[PDB]
Design a protein around this nucleic acid. Structure first.
Ligand SMILES: Nc1ncnc2c1ncn2[C@@H]1O[C@H](COP(=O)(O)OP(=O)(O)OP(=O)(O)O)[C@@H](O)[C@H]1O
Lengths: 80, 96, 444, 96, 109, 85, 97, 109, 96
DNA sequence: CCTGGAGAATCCCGGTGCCGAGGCCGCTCAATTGGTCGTAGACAGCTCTAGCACCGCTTAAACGCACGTACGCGCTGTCCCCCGCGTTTTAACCGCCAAGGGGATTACTCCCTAGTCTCCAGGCACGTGTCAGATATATACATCCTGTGCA
DNA sequence: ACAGGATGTATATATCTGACACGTGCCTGGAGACTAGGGAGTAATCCCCTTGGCGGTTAAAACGCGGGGGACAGCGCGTACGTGCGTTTAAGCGGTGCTAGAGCTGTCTACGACCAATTGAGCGGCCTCGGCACCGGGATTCTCCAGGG
């Protein structure tokens, strides 16, 4: 797998910005958004993989993701 | 031929997306991105579908909040358009 | 065992038999190497004895070496005037001022060492501790010895860190609260002796051990002047508003942490409080007098003293009582004099003597209970009025005998207004407990 | 059958019928409510445990729960929750 | 003999399980001992908070011309009340969305 | 009659003190309206912390607020303080 | 004729001085009176240890210094040099208070 | 008779109190049972973190030329280091001051 | 005679002698180091407790401590700390 | 510079299918009841430390004031960059099927940990002296700022 | 663009002091040695759920183009803030006096843990039906020229 951060298309970043409430978006915003998304995802995925390794599983579970998010301070309601 | 002014469609889309509640990123590209990021920490992982859905939900929420703070910064700087420097200021004051 | 007459080196010296014998006693104490306490209350005078002692040490065997006197700032120019009057041979130096003045004075006078006697205050002593420690001291005189009555106090520690060959404590009331502070004074006198803290176990043993190195005489049985005092305690029951204020405070927003302190000055003037005062100062009028029982008592006593001497006294314990009484004095078109820490020191001190006059026709002189110093030649006073009593009977004794100078040849009167069913009764009970302890331990 | 999974779902449904008699809930909303109840339980219990440790004690009691509620809930919610808990303890003591 | 088993929830008049809360407290490793009234207090508090949020959610769902409470209604109820927002300020509700707000500058002249 | 309220204790913290705080922060020019806002922000922060500390002291059944109570309240707020317990 | 520094050099030297120093900047007695007045609201007849007020003062100084740092960042973002109440409010809004 | 008592810290080559850590784990209400190697592991980790911070603080103190360590040196060590800054990001060190930094825009030119 | 208090001061001073022979510490700095050790202990122990509860086990072990260290520390510190702890347990199991 | 049409966009309104919400049933495991015991904690008594209130003196800090100067804040002009829209391409989405990996469960065994007792040595409170840090004092240096010639 | 002066600041030296490092006595908790029991390791089995392929449909993304609005720089002004000075004030340090209240001991009791028997409350599984989603058609509303006001 390679070059999959580009799958986060410009229309999707525009839709997220529109939900945020922004009207005008500069051209350099998209690379910055891809970077910040990658950093956040990497933190959460590392913590989830640590939980999964402790459980000695090979499958990452919704509970693992929720526990990682709770550790980060970003509690998620709905999946467990 | 009828043509809208630059900013009517943006406001209509703002209302539409702030009314809706669905995910705003493509599921398969997000899933491939998650698998790619997981490739580094451990080889040959498997994922439940709910795990990928929860990850996508959290990512959407984080980006939405960040964009809201960026919009506040851009309005503070007497602008309408958001910029990378706006995002960076938002992150720095958040605590990253 | 010394000269029975006045020394030949003292000018205008009219010291009497008690003073010459006390000088001989101090001389003999120096000869035997024992440091003592001169416990003459007020009348015999101790400044004269100290000056004569230093003059003896100078004009006799050659020890004009570094000598130190510690006095409060309220008595600095008084001590300088006494030194220049009685024995002008000594070159006393007064050490007062801020950083630059202190530096100029020390560098230009103290370091060259042409001086003979250094007079400073406790605060300047603490300030210049380090520069003072270098000089080897032959004789250290501490006036008002009850200042160092408490061990582990900064002045006590510093004065103990000095290297003094001889020591001398001056105090008019050696005992104030208990035997531990007296032991502290004895420890400063001779640290190598009274290392341990400890009517047959007490009183008599302390009297016998104090007799070799303590001397105390009484103005009545020595001077034969200063006619006795008739003390009257007038019991005044607080009026309805005062009683209800007392109850409403005792049973109960406003901060009430120290119940004892807050209940106290309420009998004196219930309007010193913050937020419980009546409306804004619309005018100065009959609001102060009528609303306090002690105020109505003093106000009805005043016309008698006016039709009579009208130069009597005022004594109280709170600066806010002092301020409200100042406002009352101005409203009643009377004139007073003010002595307090806030008023500039050097200029208040000469103002006191300035106001000392054969005639004033101003009917009021107002003093605080602790603001009293060591001078104040109010021989014009006739009665002492105590608005309230303090915990220490010694403070009240100092306040009452401040107006009992010899300048006073007529019998002085002591008036006390006391509020019934209040805390004044206990305060009086403690005070009399302490006074009885002091009397039995010293006078008996 | 499969293993059992505890949930607060039936109690949440009963409370819902108490407040709005003719309304219903979806499975996702019930999952959210179950998570909310677990989260609040965790916060209150952890705060009470820390209180018991600080006071050098070994029992969790109604005083500890009340103090935790005061610390965690803001303002009006704290007031009303303390009132309700006191009422429930009074009823339990009387009807025991 | 023995009387009919009366649940402690019915004894306290609560809709939440007092005995289950007691067991969760004992097996949660919060303290060595658990008092009798602590489960009752905790169940009452949980009931009050649940009733509050469900009342707000029901009103929101009614305003939308629906009779089933969905995460959108829960999110609106939580974010439109300041105390519940402060309680759930760090919490993300799945399929909730955001509150409609547009900053007044962006509105056309 | 000579008696009146002295001041208000929020005015006890002063303009020069706030200027020193801003200098430590790294500020050069300061508007004149900053001081009222800083007083309000400080009041809010102290209110929250003191409320939590008073709750802890009430639970302990004491009438004295201790440094341990302040440290526990700060840790609750997410502002851990090292150097008092 | 008298020597005068231009408007902004003494400020910079104060920045350096107070960033090198370590002691507390608010006055102890005013801060203690403020703490007691605030405690009056929640409970009457309260005592304070000496260490409690010092810990409170340390926390207040740290909080205000960090807030002013973020305020300066916002003011520079708006291409100003002066800080404003709107800068303070933006800092608080982004931090989440 | 009995053998001479060797401390578990000595057995594991540590300068931290393994037995005290074990007692704290058992009385801190973290689980029902505690392993033998868990206190040893925790003591070693605490030792490593303490050694790291003390080394950095001592270097800072030597840079300022003081042979004693003060909270100012502790704060200077904790900042200027990304890992320890992440660890103690939300921790205030009493009388430790602030890192010297002035924004370049304010600098005169 | 005053009651006793348990502190890490002796061990901190030993580590200081090990890492800087001719250097000292002050009382306030020692209090800060004591607080720091207590805080890190609390964080690691709480993470281990929650891990054991998640996996439905009643015993905290070296696996739990290792995972808690990996979760709470950022990167290089985590790696070096894991090496340290593994070395310590190996030496402890070697003959004891 | 305000109206008035066009023209998209949105809302409203009726009808059709579907699938998840709500009810019902059987079963079993967790909560209730009853009885016993041993320790945590409540309560009273006593000690002595630390907090509260006040005064006196010094001096650093705060406060009020005057002057000028950068600095914030409108205004204007240029132009470039982003938005709105039509078109083409690409890949997501959806349904279906097949296959295996790995999560989940159960039974069995044994090894590690808790619980006790004994005793002894590490660690803590207390006391003490000396050295590192604080302070003062006079160089030496560095930095700012304005003024004068001649760039 | 430099000279010189006037601030401020870093450096080197001498004194003094109070806090730190060390020592000593004592005691309470940790180590050494034993027991027993249940929690976790291990193996084996089942089945479900994840991955992987595959084809068709269609929405969504990529691409290009034109134009208008907003960013950004420049300029001017007039005002509010920094700087320095002289006056006032109250903070900080030292003392005093007192007492509440925190902290430790002793004692007993009532409350929670524990165990056994019992039973009904809740959970999984199942069926069914009304609320919701979608759809198309018509009515209302917002936006943008263009034009005669
Ligand atoms: N020149 C003098 N002639 C006679 N008696 C004198 C003289 N100077 C002082 N005294 C005595 O001293 C008494 C009080 O004088 P003064 O006020 O100077 O004393 P003091 O220094 O304040 O005393 P102390 O501090 O020892 O109580 C007089 O009543 C008198 O007995």
């Amino acid at each position: 797998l390679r070059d999959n951060i580009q799958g986060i298309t410009k229309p999707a970043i525009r839709r997220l910005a529109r939900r945020g409430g922004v009207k005008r978006i500069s051209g350099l915003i998209y690379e910055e958004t891809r970077g910040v998304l990658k950093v956040f995802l990497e933190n959460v995925i590392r913590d989830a993989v640590t939980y999964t390794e402790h459980a000695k599983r090979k499958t990452v579970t919704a509970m693992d993701v929720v526990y990682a998010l709770k550790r980060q301070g970003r509690t998620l309601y709905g999946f467990g | 031929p009828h043509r809208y002014r630059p900013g009517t469609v943006a406001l209509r889309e703002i209302r539409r997306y702030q009314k809706s509640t669905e995910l705003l990123i493509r599921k398969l590209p997000f899933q491939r991105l998650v698998r790619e990021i997981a490739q580094d920490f451990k080889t040959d992982l498997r994922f439940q579908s709910s795990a990928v859905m929860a990850l996508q939900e959290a990512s959407e929420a984080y980006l939405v909040g960040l964009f809201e703070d960026t919009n506040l910064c851009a309005i503070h700087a007497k602008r309408v358009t958001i910029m990378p420097k706006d995002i960076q200021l938002a992150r720095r004051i958040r605590g990253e | 065992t010394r000269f029975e007459d006045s020394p030949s080196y003292v000018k205008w010296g009219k010291l009497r038999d008690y003073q010459v014998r006390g000088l001989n006693w101090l001389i003999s104490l120096y000869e035997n190497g024992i440091n003592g306490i001169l416990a003459d209350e007020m009348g015999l005078g101790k400044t004269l004895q100290t000056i004569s002692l230093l003059g003896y040490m100078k004009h006799y065997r050659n020890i004009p070496g570094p000598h130190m006197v510690l006095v409060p700032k309220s008595t600095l120019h008084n001590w300088m005037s006494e030194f220049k009057r009685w024995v002008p041979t000594l070159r006393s130096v007064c050490l007062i001022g801020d950083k630059e003045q202190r530096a100029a004075f020390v560098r230009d006078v103290l370091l060259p060492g042409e001086w003979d006697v250094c007079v400073t205050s406790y605060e300047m002593l603490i300030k210049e501790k380090s520069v003072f420690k270098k000089f080897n001291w032959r004789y250290l005189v501490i006036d008002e010895a009850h200042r160092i009555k408490n061990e582990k106090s900064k002045l006590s520690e510093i004065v103990r860190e000095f290297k003094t060959t001889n020591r001398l404590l001056l105090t008019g009331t050696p005992l104030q609260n208990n035997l531990h502070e007296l032991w502290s004074l004895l420890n400063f006198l001779l640290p190598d002796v009274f290392n341990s803290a400890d009517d047959q176990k007490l009183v008599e043993r302390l009297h016998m051990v104090l007799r070799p190195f303590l001397l105390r005489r009484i103005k009545a049985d020595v001077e034969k002047s200063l006619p006795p005092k008739k003390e009257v305690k007038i019991y005044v029951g607080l009026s309805k508003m005062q009683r209800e204020w007392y109850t409403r405070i005792l049973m109960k927003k406003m901060r009430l942490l120290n119940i004892l302190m807050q209940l106290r000055k309420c009998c004196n003037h219930p309007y010193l409080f913050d937020g419980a005062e009546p409306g804004p100062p619309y005018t100065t009028d009959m609001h102060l007098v009528t609303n306090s029982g002690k105020m109505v008592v003093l106000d009805k006593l005043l016309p008698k003293l006016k039709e009579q001497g009208s130069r009597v006294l005022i004594f109280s314990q709170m600066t806010r009582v002092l301020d409200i009484l100042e406002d009352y004095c101005m409203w009643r078109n009377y004139e007073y004099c003010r002595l307090d820490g806030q008023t500039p020191h050097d200029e208040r001190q000469d103002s006191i003597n300035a106001y000392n006059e054969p005639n004033s026709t101003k009917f009021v002189f107002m003093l605080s209970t602790r603001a009293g110093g060591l001078g104040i030649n109010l021989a014009t006073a006739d009665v002492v009025i105590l608005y309230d009593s303090d915990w220490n009977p010694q403070v009240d004794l100092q306040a009452m005998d401040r107006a009992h100078r010899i300048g006073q040849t007529k019998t002085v009167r002591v008036f006390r207004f006391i509020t019934d069913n209040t805390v004044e009764e206990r305060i009086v009970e403690r005070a009399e407990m302490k006074l009885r302890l002091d009397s039995i331990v010293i006078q008996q | 059958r499969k293993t059992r999974k505890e949930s607060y779902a039936i109690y949440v449904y009963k409370v819902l019928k108490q407040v709005h008699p003719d309304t219903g809930i979806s499975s996702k909303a019930m999952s959210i409510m179950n998570s909310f109840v677990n989260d609040v339980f965790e916060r209150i219990a952890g705060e009470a445990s820390r209180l018991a440790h600080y006071n050098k004690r070994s029992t969790i009691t109604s005083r500890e729960i009340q103090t935790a509620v005061r610390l965690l809930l803001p303002g009006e919610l704290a007031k009303h929750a303390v009132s309700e808990g006191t009422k429930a303890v009074t009823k339990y003591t009387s009807a025991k | 003999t023995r009387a009919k088993a009366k649940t402690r929830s019915s004894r306290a008049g609560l809709q939440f399980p007092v005995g289950r809360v007691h067991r969760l407290l004992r097996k949660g490793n919060y303290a060595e001992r658990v008092g009798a009234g602590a489960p009752v207090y905790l169940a009452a508090v949980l009931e009050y908070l649940t009733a509050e949020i469900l009342e707000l959610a029901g009103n929101a769902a009614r305003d939308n011309k629906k009779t089933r409470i969905i995460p959108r209604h829960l999110q609106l109820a939580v974010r439109n009340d300041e105390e519940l927002n402060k309680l759930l300020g760090r919490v993300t509700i799945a399929q909730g969305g955001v509150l409609p707000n547009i900053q007044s500058v962006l509105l056309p002249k």
